[PDB]
Design a protein around this nucleic acid. Structure first.
Lengths: 129, 62, 224, 76, 72, 48, 95, 195
RNA sequence: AGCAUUUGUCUAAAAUACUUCCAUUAAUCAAGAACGAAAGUUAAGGGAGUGAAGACGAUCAGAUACCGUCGUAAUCUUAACCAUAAACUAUGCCGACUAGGUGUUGGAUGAAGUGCUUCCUUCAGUACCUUAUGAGAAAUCAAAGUCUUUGGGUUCUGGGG
RNA sequence: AGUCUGGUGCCAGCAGCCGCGGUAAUUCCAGCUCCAAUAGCGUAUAUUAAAAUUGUUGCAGUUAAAACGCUCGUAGUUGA
């Protein structure tokens, strides 16, 4: 069975981007996926997407820019302190300067830069670059 | 940046470098602290300073 | 020095229509004549030398009814000290010949590395601008960016090769049989080679195309 | 480009959007001529109303009616 | 530092030593249907060519620039 | 797939598997087992 | 028995520079080779002349797989000088 | 205008062989019940014109190579070589030719025109090692490995090959200064066919 | 594990089709359990052929062997046990994603040979060929891929000889 | 950092390891020279790194060590 929706979605996108497909259909839509794509969109690492409805969870069709080098989901949903963030980013991201490590916080889902500015730790969701 | 501990400690360390004579006046940023280099530090030995200023005629003489 | 060119690209470089090695890199052309590389980086009246070094000479034997048949394989490293490394391999019957051939191969291989920095604009480039990994055989080598508060934290071999490329400060790691020297060198070379392939924010934006040298100097080739 | 591909109708049940390939049919019996509601893919025997004479024979496909009868689609 | 080409079809960076990548120059006409001087240029990565998808990608690219009529 | 458990509460399985599997190693066995103090002629003294 | 590369190669070179003089007699060909070639041995000159004669004899049954020739250029001059149902439906569809 | 389409049409170039192949599916019109594939044609004509523009856009035409290795196509390519500035290489391919710098026969061209990708496959592969894009007369059985502009055509019929080359030549000549688009070209279609 | 004569009876099974019902009931699972080739054991039948043992005749320097002739036990049914096998795709199981073509066994949908037959489209089994700017230590692998750009879930296992 | 000089001659010995020593020993025993660290420098035993060879991060299990014979299933872990 699927378990976490999000991991399948990024894995699917990532394959399409590595392959050079230009557009791709993510099968099991959810609230979290919408937030993730929208967050990615805000910081310009993916294009416009159409969520097409159903009556059983929708589907989403996402326009690729030919720009994502790697996107994946961190699992299980590890807890992480505001203090710990630097050590996480150093470990995962391909550079300190660029790419994004994405969290779920009481103030919403955002990347680390935002979290640092805010305050609040949370659970780590995934990352892209 | 703007972190209270960071501004305080960084400035303090840098001021200590200025006292030592490791960093010039124009530089005042932590990447010039990283830029510090082993001849630059040796250049601040008292024997070196004497040899430069005179008195002796050799480093060994100094 | 002043050879007769075999092919069109070479002919253009001899004459001086082609400005510098960047232009041929830009259009990803096959730099077949060693003379082309040699002309751009000729050691006097130019910015920086190309420095050679024989990193490893290893004996290999075919084995025959009569006996051994000993060849000498040679791994050689070439580097400008300012953005260009080259990894050269030649296997030949005798030692001096093998080295000479290897230096030719090394010049042919020559690749430009992308250089960047850990933090800020207030240094010129000094480190590998993002994590890059190159694998060959068993051995996988990863270059990972470090502040200027560092040297090259690596194997002797990695330190030498990366220094040759003109990348001052890095953190390195490795997994597998590093002792298999040639494979380790090739892996390092691939890792360096990957550096300008990456695509990063500095390169997100669209831009125009220069004309290919084959089209820009079409007339000058057509006349011969 | 899989957002709006029109000629995808030929694909298996489970396409971009679910759609049944099954419909209801307005049928009438030859020589008795009363209207009847009926299901393409009916799973049990189907009678005409006035005198129970079979209409459709069920079988595991689309179901095979009888040789007679005339059929409108009963979609709105 | 130099700026490497980015692919017209895939929007992706063309490697330094690739050789599989190409620049195709497509000539404009004058009004009579005779060859102008000027050229609309496309850069095609080795990667799509190696796969063999190059014609399909090229067709969509031509449609986007408004040269080939039919699209796909 | 990954073969090791991963879960947020799976710490027990990770500890139990590691604790048993530690006994595979040659060096570890030499350090932690009682045979040491018996069969070693110097009884683990450096000198005699 | 046959003829080696040195012999065949020479045989091809002669004809290449002297086709017009060369002819369908062995003695005349041998005279031509003696004039033209730099070969130092009698036996070798004869061997070359024999094979050039054999190639010359071979031609006039189409190309000899070597040597540019005027005869070919002339030969080249001599050489130079409703429908199915668905296919109709396609033509109709196109317009 | 129509006339090119009609001239092509009468020749059997629309009859592709069996064995559809995925990538060519968009250029097939329909499989005839017989087991041969009819080829759209109209798309071929537009494509052919595109190809003509790319051939014309090369300022030195000597750097434009035609290649084939089938006797019945040989005549067509040699004639094509005479009329446009393009050099043909016909007969057996020399299989070091593009990669090898120091070989005598050599040639480093700027563009390649290939007659059948399955047939001339080493030459096609060699082209990819030194950045040549390859326009391609492509058919039912063709792979499209390293071919950029694909021109749908029956590659197997001698008349078909001749007709195809003849139209290509006429377009390049029209684009060039040679002939205004009002006039039919002088050279017979018959001139490019095998004997 | 294994299963090939005929028909009957009792049973299960999977796929398909389904504008049929239930509404998270699930996934993998230490513990424990069911089944578990072949040989072997215990007991009754049964006993043709085959045939460890054994007996001879040969072959060989020698032959307790290969080869030959004969030949108990076992092989077969019933009723218990045994619990292992290179019990082998040497590939844990569930889940998503990737790339073509050639087939094939089982359904269902449309169209075209003489209601039936065929072909098309499509599911589910299931192999093969080519292809991997995928992977691998290579052999090779459409999974051994989507991996230092390392984290979809999980059981079990290994750590020089 | 020594294809330097003598003695020994498979012996004596050295040698963590690979190996060296059977009459030119670049390894022994000396002498000479050279080299590393230096008022400190060797040796032993334990211990950490090196070890992503204990692996959460972060291993391997077709063939190198390693998928339970097969399935059901309770605890466990995981759950649109």
């Amino acid at each position: 069975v699927r378990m976490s929706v999000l991991a399948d979605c990024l894995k699917t996108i990532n394959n399409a981007e590595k392959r050079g497909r230009r557009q791709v259909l993510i099968r099991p839509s959810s609230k979290v996926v919408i937030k993730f794509l929208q967050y990615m969109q805000k910081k310009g690492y993916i294009g416009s997407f159409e969520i097409v409805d159903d009556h059983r969870s929708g589907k989403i069709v996402v326009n690729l820019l030919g720009r994502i080098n790697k996107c994946a989901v961190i699992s299980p949903r590890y807890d992480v302190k505001l203090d710990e963030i630097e050590k996480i980013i150093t470990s995962i991201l391909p550079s300190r300067l660029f790419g994004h490590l994405i969290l779920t916080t009481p103030y919403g889902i955002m990347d680390h830069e935002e979290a640092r500015r805010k305050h609040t730790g949370g659970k780590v969701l995934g990352f892209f670059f | 940046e703007k972190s209270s501990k960071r501004i305080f400690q960084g400035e303090a360390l840098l001021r200590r470098m200025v006292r030592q004579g490791l960093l010039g006046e124009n530089e005042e940023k932590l990447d010039y602290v990283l830029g510090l280099t082993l001849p630059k530090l040796l250049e601040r030995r008292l024997q070196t300073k004497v040899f430069k200023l005179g008195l002796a005629k050799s480093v060994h003489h100094a | 020095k002043n050879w007769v060119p075999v092919t069109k690209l070479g002919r253009l470089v001899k004459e001086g229509k082609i400005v510098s090695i960047e232009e041929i890199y830009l259009h990803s052309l096959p730099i077949k004549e060693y003379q082309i590389i040699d002309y751009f980086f000729q050691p006097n009246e130019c910015s920086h030398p190309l420095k050679d070094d024989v990193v490893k000479i290893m004996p290999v034997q075919k084995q025959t009814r009569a006996g051994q048949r000993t060849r000498f394989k040679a791994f050689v490293a070439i580097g400008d000290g300012n953005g260009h490394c080259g990894l050269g391999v030649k296997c030949a019957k005798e030692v001096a010949t093998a080295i000479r051939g290897a230096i030719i191969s090394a010049k042919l291989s020559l690749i430009p590395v992308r250089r960047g920095y850990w933090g800020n604009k207030i240094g010129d480039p000094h480190t590998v601008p993002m994590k890059v990994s190159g694998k060959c055989g068993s051995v996988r080598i990863r270059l990972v960016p470090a502040p200027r508060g560092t040297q090259i934290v690596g194997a002797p071999t990695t330190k030498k090769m990366l220094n040759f490329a003109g990348i001052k400060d890095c953190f390195s790691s490795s997994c597998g049989k590093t002792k298999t020297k040639g494979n380790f060198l090739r892996a390092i070379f691939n890792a360096l080679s990957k550096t300008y392939g990456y695509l990063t924010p500095d390169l997100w934006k669209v831009t125009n195309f220069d004309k290919s040298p084959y089209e820009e100097w079409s007339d000058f080739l057509e006349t011969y | 480009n899989p957002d709006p591909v029109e000629e995808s109708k030929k694909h298996k049940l489970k396409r971009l959007i679910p759609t049944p390939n099954s419909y209801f049919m307005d049928v009438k019996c030859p020589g008795c001529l009363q209207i009847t509601t009926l299901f393409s893919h009916a799973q049990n025997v189907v009678l005409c109303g006035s005198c129970n004479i079979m209409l459709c024979q069920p079988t595991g496909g689309k179901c095979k009616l009888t040789e007679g009868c005339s059929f409108r689609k009963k979609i709105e | 530092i130099y700026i490497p080409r980015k692919c017209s079809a895939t929007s992706r960076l063309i490697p330094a030593k690739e050789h599989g990548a190409v620049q195709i120059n497509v000539g404009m006409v004058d009004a009579n249907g005779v060859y102008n001087g000027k050229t609309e240029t496309f850069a095609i990565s080795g990667h799509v060519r190696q796969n063999g998808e190059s014609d399909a990608c090229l067709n969509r690219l031509m449609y986007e620039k408004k040269l080939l009529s039919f699209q796909n | 797939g990954s073969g090791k458990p991963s879960g947020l509460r799976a710490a027990r399985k990770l500890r139990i598997r590691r604790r048993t599997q530690r006994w595979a190693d040659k060096s570890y066995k030499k350090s932690h087992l009682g045979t040491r103090w018996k069969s070693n002629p110097f009884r683990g003294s450096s000198h005699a | 028995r046959v003829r080696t590369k040195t012999i065949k190669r020479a045989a091809r070179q002669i004809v290449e520079k002297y086709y017009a003089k060369l002819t369908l007699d062995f003695q005349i060909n041998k005279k031509i080779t003696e004039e033209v070639a730099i070969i130092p041995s009698k036996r070798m000159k004869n061997k070359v002349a024999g094979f050039v004669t054999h190639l010359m004899k071979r031609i006039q049954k189409g190309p000899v797989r070597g040597i540019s020739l005027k005869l070919q250029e002339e030969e080249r001059e001599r050489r130079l000088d409703y429908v199915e149902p668905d296919t109709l439906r396609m033509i109709k569809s196109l317009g | 205008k129509e006339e090119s389409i009609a001239k092509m049409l009468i020749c059997k170039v629309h009859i592709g062989t069996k064995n559809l192949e995925n990538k060519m599916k968009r250029y097939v019109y329909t499989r005839a019940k017989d087991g041969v594939h009819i080829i759209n044609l109209a798309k071929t004509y537009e494509k052919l014109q595109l190809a003509a523009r790319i051939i014309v856009a090369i300022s030195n035409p000597a750097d434009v190579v035609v290649v084939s290795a089938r006797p019945f196509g040989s005549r067509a390519v040699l004639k094509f070589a005479q009329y446009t500035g393009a050099q043909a290489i016909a007969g057996r391919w020399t299989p070091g030719m593009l990669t090898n710098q120091i070989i005598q026969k050599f040639t480093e061209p700027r563009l390649l025109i290939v007659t059948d990708p399955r047939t001339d496959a080493q030459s096609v592969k060699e082209s990819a090692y030194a950045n040549i894009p390859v326009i391609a007369l492509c058919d039912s059985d063709s792979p499209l490995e390293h071919v950029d502009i694909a021109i749908p055509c029956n590659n197997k019929g001698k008349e078909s090959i001749a007709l195809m080359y003849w139209l290509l030549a006429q377009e390049v000549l029209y684009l060039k200064g040679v002939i205004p688009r009002s006039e039919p070209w002088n050279v017979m279609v018959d001139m490019f066919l095998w004997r």
